[PDB]
Amino acid sequence: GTVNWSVEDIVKGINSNNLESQLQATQAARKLLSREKQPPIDNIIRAGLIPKFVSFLGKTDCSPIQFESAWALTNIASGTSEQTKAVVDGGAIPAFISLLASPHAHISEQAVWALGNIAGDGSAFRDLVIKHGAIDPLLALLAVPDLSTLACGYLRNLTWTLSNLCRNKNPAPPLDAVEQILPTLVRLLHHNDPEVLADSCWAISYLTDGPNERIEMVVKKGVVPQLVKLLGATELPIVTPALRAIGNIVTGTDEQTQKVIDAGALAVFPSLLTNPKTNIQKEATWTMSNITAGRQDQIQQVVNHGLVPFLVGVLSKADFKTQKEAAWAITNYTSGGTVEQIVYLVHCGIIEPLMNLLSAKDTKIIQVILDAISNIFQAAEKLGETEKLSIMIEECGGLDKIEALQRHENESVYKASLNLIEKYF
């Protein structure tokens, strides 16, 4: 009945002076726009239908046409930035924000969805959505004693749209908007739905992806223990953002990093550093690299938790991008670590896999590895042990690889290598 209309049929119906014909044509547009294969968004826009859809959002008297137009506009806004812009340029933002108050849950939800798509376009529309006042009404939809009474899909859509208001940088969301949203995120982070948890973790990962003052806003809210708990979830869609968030947090201060350690994060890293999902291993190792860039007592907790053998493991065998993060973890470890900690690292077998990576066709990892070799030697001469160390490097082919690096197409590489070959070989 409303299936497979032409755009011109839709235009004809929406231009009739007949609200029911308009509703029928808007639903036909919605069904057109709801098919996964090549929805004719541009034809719909070119036909001038967005302003009509937007005007239909205001027809409180005809809630079906609000819903159908909200859904049509949601799917136009889900398209390209130009398509989202067409929706915004039609005045949809204030019209959707007004629909958040709709008594019809499926219309309110659709407006949530539409605003998520608009905000999800980028910082400017995100901030324009915020400036139009979306946050208060969005959070009010979550102002219930127990989130579990909300419809599952509705709560998921709200959490997702909130995460888009937290998303994107240059600029990051307004500080006041973040402070306004955070209490609700913290609460969603304790909800038991895996998708709400995933999107809540994504939102926190966005908010912690910035300067330490941004991290601090999040950490002050006490979420780190919950993020660590979610770090141990079985659902990869949860572990992924929880780990991103934790990784972001340990890019901050030593005190912020220490909150992650105190929360027990390190006990999860045996699994994370051996995780069969490549991106988990990579992000876990990146996280480790920023923990080993911290204080010596923080390095010591990496040690006590038995994570140095896991770093040796990653360095020995992993996706190359993960090995590069592991190399950073080692150079940070050796830059900041006591002599005893660096000795322990050698006793765990770091030398051989470090050496094997010096044959990487990647200039940055070579530099990183050479820094670490240098830092390990520095600790050796504090013990009169450079000879034992040099043998080790020779015993596993490392001396050969440091030799070839002297003649290498890069200043810092040839420099640091040549230095090693004479200061210790």
């Binding site: 709801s34 889900s78 969805w113 798509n117 995933a198 992806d209 953002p241 990146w286 860039a293 150079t331």
Partner: peptide
């Protein structure tokens, strides 16, 4: 020495 989800979703059903 520290170093530092679909955004848009159509409704199909």
């Amino acid at each position: 020495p520290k170093r530092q989800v679909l955004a848009k979703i159509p409704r199909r059903e």
